[PDB]
Structures are given as C-alpha cells and as structure tokens.
Amino acid sequence: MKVRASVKKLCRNCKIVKRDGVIRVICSAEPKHKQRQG
Amino acid sequence: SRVAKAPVVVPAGVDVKINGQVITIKGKNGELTRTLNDAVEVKHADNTLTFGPRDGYADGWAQAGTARALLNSMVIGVTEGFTKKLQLVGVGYRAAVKGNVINLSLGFSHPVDHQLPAGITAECPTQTEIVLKGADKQVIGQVAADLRAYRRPEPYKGKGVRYADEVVRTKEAKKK
Amino acid sequence: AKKVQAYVKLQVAAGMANPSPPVGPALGQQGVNIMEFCKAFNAKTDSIEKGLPIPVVITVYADRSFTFVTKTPPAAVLLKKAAGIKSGSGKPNKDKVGKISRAQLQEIAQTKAADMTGADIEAMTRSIEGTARSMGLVVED
C-alpha cells in the first residue's frame, strides 16, 4: 500500500471505504492504484 | 428500506428457538445459531420472519440489516449446503482427503497436514480439485481462505491455489 | 436473427482467397474450417469483376455449425469506384471535385432494393449525399 496525503479517485472502478479510519482506495485489477493516508 | 422490504420465509424442516436475543436454529444437519446485538426486534410472525430496529440504536437498520441477510443464509445452509471447490495449479501439487484432514503438497521440505474443524465434510475428486461442504457461510470460506493464503495466485505464471470461480490476472515477464 | 453469441458483418474484396489477418478473427470465433468459407462463396464470385469490398455477415449455431448471408456491395464503395480514387475524404467541407447525379444513386439502390429490406431508396439518398460531402464531392442533377 503506497502512502501519500492525497487519496484521489484515479482508476475508473475505484472503490472507497473507510477501514479503521484511514482511507484506502480499492481498485479491481490494478494494484498500483491503491493509496493509504489522508 | 430495501432491507425493510425484505422479509425471510422459514420453511418446514428448520426450527427456531426464540429466547429473545439468543436464537438457536434447529435445522437439518446442524445448529446455526447467532447471538445478535440488541439493535434488533425479532419475531417469527406467522411463517415469514419479520424483524425490527430497536429505538436508541437507530443505526440498527445496519445492525439488523446484517441479520436479515444472515438468517436467510442459515436456513438454506443447514439443509442444502455450499459447494466450495478450489483449483490447485502447482507443479507436482496434489490433494487427497482422509477423515477430516487435507494434505498439502506445497513445494516444501516437509508435509503440511492440517486438521479441519466441525461443520466440514471435505472431499477430493482429484489431486487438483477439492470439495468443501458446510453449513455456515462463514466457515465455508474461513477454512478455504487459509489454504489459499498459503500459496497465493502468482501473477507471472498463474501458479498458486485459487478458487473455482476466481479468475487471476497473470502478467508477462517483458524483460528477460 | 440470432443473439449475444455472435453477429459481425465483415468481408472485403473476394479476389483474395486466404482470410486477411484482421478479417481472420471473425472467422476465428466459433471454430470454422476456413476452407469451407472459401468454398462456399466462390461458386458465385465468378459472376463479378473483382476489386470492390463485398460484405458478408457471420452467424453461428450450437455444435460446429455456422451460417452467412450474401448481399450486394455497399453504395459507400460504389461512390468511390466510379470516382476513380478509393479515398477522397481529406477535407470534407473544403473540397469541391466530382459530380454524380441521383440517377446513378438509385440504380445502385435497385440492387439494394433487390437484395435488402433496409437501406431503402429515398432514405439513403441523403446519406449517399452524406457520404459525398464528407469526402468533399459535389452533386447536381
């Protein structure tokens, strides 16, 4: 999970759910599109 | 809501034991009980079960919205069951069932034979296909996902242990 | 006719026996002997002077079967068969070269009227005027 202050909804099918409070964004086929902070 | 427009119809062959918050479902081949939270108002009204969110816990529409989906699965799981098949794609990798134990030909210097708990009648038609049978929807995944986590799908060959319906995304080397 | 299994209309000039690589996949969909589609159409291909893309459609069936529908060549390539060059659309509304009147357009529409139930005479007339303006062609009668 890459970390950066900006979670920008980047991939076309990008889920966003708030697990534990810190946002981590869920793609389907792209592992590269998953950030976690912010 | 959609969940409030979703009542569940218990059929004949599965008995409920409504001691208020604690419901123990006497079914076909097991006992699928869940001790829910106090954000629910349960009533097996006539035959079709009706539920309700308790006051104070107005977020119990969520907490019983779990429950409406829950008990529907329980009355159909204790009778019919889940076929949870896994596909072993590994070079020299086999699967064979004995009693309640599964072998794991997993490319190690030592064998891994793990015993599997109750609510499991496992089978193996061949070395690469493995049945799992169960009554709870949780236990039919939890014992399945532990095997898959021992050898995850490798996205350079397609190697690994993977589900029947799961479709991996294998890549290409592209350098050497 | 059929449904979500397969329906693509792709065939180009039938002087070439071997399936051209991009056409290949529309024959590479439901398991054909590619010699069969070469031997089906050549009994009627000897009634033409080759050079224009003639279209066929593919449509499939359960076991190993298939079927196909023969029509006439479309008027879009018939616009640029008479005009000499096969590709004229470089600038649509800035080129004024080349005239054919409506009388040529209806006699290449009777061969559509004797073949197909859509692509009717009077409705296609503005689109056979519409494929003229995109190519940069003029029309007068």
Binding site: - | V91, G92, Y93, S105 | -
Partner: protein, 286 residues
C-alpha cells in the same frame, strides 16, 4: 523419481502432439518415492534395484499384487502390436495361439526398419533404477550395422545406380568424416566411424569429393577422454582418422579403385553474428 512424473500420460501425449503411435513396454511400480519396480511386460517381470548402492541387484520377481489388473489391460495391447505389424500374427491374436516373449519381438524388430512405433521405458538414471534394465532392448530393438542397409555408394556423375555394399570385411574400405575436433598435440583430430571393411596402419586415405591426397597416421581411440592408440581398426569401431591435410563435413575416407560417395546434405546457417575485437595490437596478429 520426481513429482508430476506420470509415465502413462507422456507416452499417451505423443499420440496428441507428436501424432505418432507409441506402444510402451516397461511400466511403473511405486508412488515415485518408494519406487522399486519397473514393469517389463513381455516377460511380465518386475525388477528389484539397489537399496541405495551404485549397482548391486537385478532381482526379477512376478508382477506385484498392487498392479495385477493394470498389467492385465496393458499386456493385451502389447500383443495387439504384432497382429498389425505383420499380417501373419493377425490370425493368432484371434485364434489364441500363445504370444510368447520370443515370438512377438521377431515381428516388432521389423517394425523398427520402417519406424512407426518407438519403444519407451521409464526409470531413473541417477537413482540406478532402470539403467541395467535398458541395455537388453538395445540388442533387440535398436538396429545393428550388419542388419541395416549398409554402405550404399552410388557413382559420381555417369548414372544413378545406388549399390548396396557388404557390411562385412569382404568389401572395399569405406568410412565418413565427422566430429572433427582439434588438439595442440597433432593439430586436427577426428571422431570418425567405419561402417565396414578393415584398414591397416598407414594408408593413402584420400577425400575423394574434393580431390586431395592425405596419408593415414597413428590412429587413437578414447574413453571419450584418454589417448589409447588404436592400430588395427576393425569394421565398426569409432576412432580418430588422424593426419588429414584437408577434410570437410562428411566426405569419404576411402582407398582408390573402390566405390565413392559424394554427399553433403543440409549445410546449416549460423545466424547470430557478433564481432570480436582484440585487446592488444599483438593480439590481432594471433
């Protein structure tokens, strides 16, 4: 002796990819780790191997009880393989004359001169399991230089008359030149094989395809590595036709006034081209 090593899969994979007709003979006993027996099906005997020794036992026993039916359904396909090899075994597959170990190979050996079936054998080289088994088929399923069509020298340019010469010692001498290695002792060396005839030591062996004269020096045999001087080369040995002045790929090694070959087929093309450069300017001289 490996995982995923199914014997019956691979021989029945040839009929799908290679498209050939293999009928295997020596089958498998053991679950690849406790593997002890190789199932020869003609004599219907399993062979014991070494506990872990580099080569003690050869103990033949019967078919074990754990494979009493797979030996049944596979032996009946072995004895099929002579009724459709020769036409004469067709009427005793069905009539029921006994298909012995010795009778069936007399048809199948003639099925190696046309090569429609190949003979397969499972076992281990490194675990010493099968190597002592694999030798007896070579004298009975691989052809001899006197059982084959021998040296066939055609002519030169006059007429196409292919002439089967004799495989014995009663012919003009004949050999071929291949695997022509080098050495810092004598220079050029060969790994040549003589098909028939006997040569003495010291001869005016020519190379009759390229019109050159050579003389036959001190011939040396090997254990693939060690110099052993072979003086008298008999018909069928493989040695080093030493001291050839010029020699090409596959020309004759033959006395004059004799039959003559002129044959070079499938000259290859080395494709990848890299340019070597010297280190010092004294190096490019060498």
């Amino acid at each position: 002796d490996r995982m995923g090593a199914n014997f019956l899969k691979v021989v029945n994979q040839i009929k799908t990819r290679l498209g050939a007709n293999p009928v295997p003979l020596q089958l498998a006993i053991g679950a690849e780790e406790h593997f002890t027996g190789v199932v020869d099906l003609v004599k219907m005997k399993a062979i014991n191997w070494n506990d872990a020794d580099q080569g003690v036992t050869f103990e033949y026993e019967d078919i074990p009880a754990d494979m009493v039916e797979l030996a049944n359904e596979w032996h009946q396909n072995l004895i099929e393989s002579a009724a459709e090899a020769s036409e004469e075994l067709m009427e005793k597959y069905l009539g029921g004359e006994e298909l012995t170990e010795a009778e069936i190979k007399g048809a199948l050996r003639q099925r190696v001169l046309n090569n429609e079936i190949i003979l397969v054998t499972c076992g281990s080289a490194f675990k010493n399991k099968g190597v002592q088994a694999m030798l007896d088929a070579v004298i009975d399923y691989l052809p001899s230089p006197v059982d084959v069509p021998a040296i066939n020298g055609i002519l030169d340019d006059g007429k196409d008359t292919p002439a089967e010469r004799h495989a014995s010692d009663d012919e003009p001498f004949s050999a071929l030149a291949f695997k022509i290695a080098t050495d810092p002792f004598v220079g050029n060396l060969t790994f040549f094989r003589v098909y028939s005839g006997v040569v003495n030591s010291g001869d005016t062996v020519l190379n009759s395809v390229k019109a050159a004269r050579e003389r036959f020096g001190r011939i040396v045999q090997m254990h693939a590595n060690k110099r052993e001087e072979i003086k008298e080369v008999r018909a069928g040995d493989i040695a080093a036709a030493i001291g050839l002045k010029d020699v090409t790929t596959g020309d004759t090694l033959c006395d004059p006034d004799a039959p003559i070959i002129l044959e070079r087929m499938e000259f290859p093309e080395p494709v990848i081209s890299i340019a070597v450069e010297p280190k010092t300017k004294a190096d490019q001289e060498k």
